[PDB]
Each structure stands twice: as structure tokens, then as C-alpha cells.
Design a protein around this ligand. Structure first.
Ligand SMILES: *[C@@H]1O[C@H](CO)[C@@H](O)[C@H](O)[C@H]1NC(C)=O
Ligand SMILES: *[C@@H]1O[C@H](CO)[C@@H](O)[C@H](O)[C@H]1NC(C)=O
Ligand SMILES: *[C@@H]1O[C@H](CO)[C@@H](O)[C@H](O)[C@H]1NC(C)=O
Lengths: 49, 49
């Protein structure tokens, strides 16, 4: 309703949208119905130790 | 002709060969027809920067 998750199609198991749950292909002007949100990189938070 | 890419088998959508599109198993000794190239590591630019 407010947040976006990625889930398997046959069972609602919401997951945080990461760069390892998704793949990048193209630009943000060709997909009809695309939305804005943040893709969490699992590596940025821990590289700054 | 000069570069090496990895595509999906049914549609020509070339991508740069990285450590995300490929998996390692073995060495350059047993595979008949293996070709030298470079495998881009996404971790290096982010770690060096
Ligand atoms: C948000 O989406 C709009 C269109 O839906 C787009 O023009 C814009 O670049 C996106 N990102 C931001 C930060 O507004
Ligand atoms: C092969 O790789 C890319 C095609 O995306 C291009 O920069 C390069 O010039 C190509 N070389 C050819 C077609 O001989
Ligand atoms: C390039 O491939 C040849 C065989 O085709 C191999 O002998 C050589 O060691 C390879 N280059 C490197 C740097 O390993």
C-alpha cells in the first residue's frame, strides 16, 4: 500500500527489493507502468566500516 | 568479431560477461574450445572507489 516488495508468484512471501532479487535492463522510459522506488544495494551499508 | 558477450539463447540481447552472468567450474585444461577473455568484476570499481 506504501512500500514495494518482490515476492514469488505462487505464495505471498514479501522480500526487500535488492540488486540480487532483480536484474537491470534498459532505461526508465520504455516500460509502460513503471514506478519509482529504491533498489537496496546489499553492499553499500557494510563497505563503510 | 572482436568482443565477447553473453546473451539469452532465444533473443539477441548481449550483455558484458561478468561474474554475475557466469559460474566457475574447473580450469583451462579440459574444456575443448575454451577462449581467453576478461571477466568483469563489479566489486572492483565499487571497492576501489
Ligand atoms: C519518478 O517518476 C517520474 C514519472 O513517473 C519520472 O519522471 C522521474 O524521473 C522519477 N524519479 C524522480 C526522482 O522523480
Ligand atoms: C563489437 O562490440 C561492440 C558492439 O556493441 C562495438 O563497440 C564493436 O565495434 C564491435 N565490433 C565489430 C562489430 O567489429
Ligand atoms: C590464451 O590461450 C592459449 C591457448 O589458446 C593459452 O595457451 C594461453 O595461456 C592463454 N593466455 C593466457 C594469458 O593464459
Amino acid at each position: 500500500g506504501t512500500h514495494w516488495f518482490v515476492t514469488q508468484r505462487n505464495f505471498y512471501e514479501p522480500q526487500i527489493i535488492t540488486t540480487d532479487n532483480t536484474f537491470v535492463s534498459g532505461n526508465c522510459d520504455v516500460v509502460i507502468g513503471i514506478v519509482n522506488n529504491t533498489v537496496y544495494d546489499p553492499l553499500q551499508p557494510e563497505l563503510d566500516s
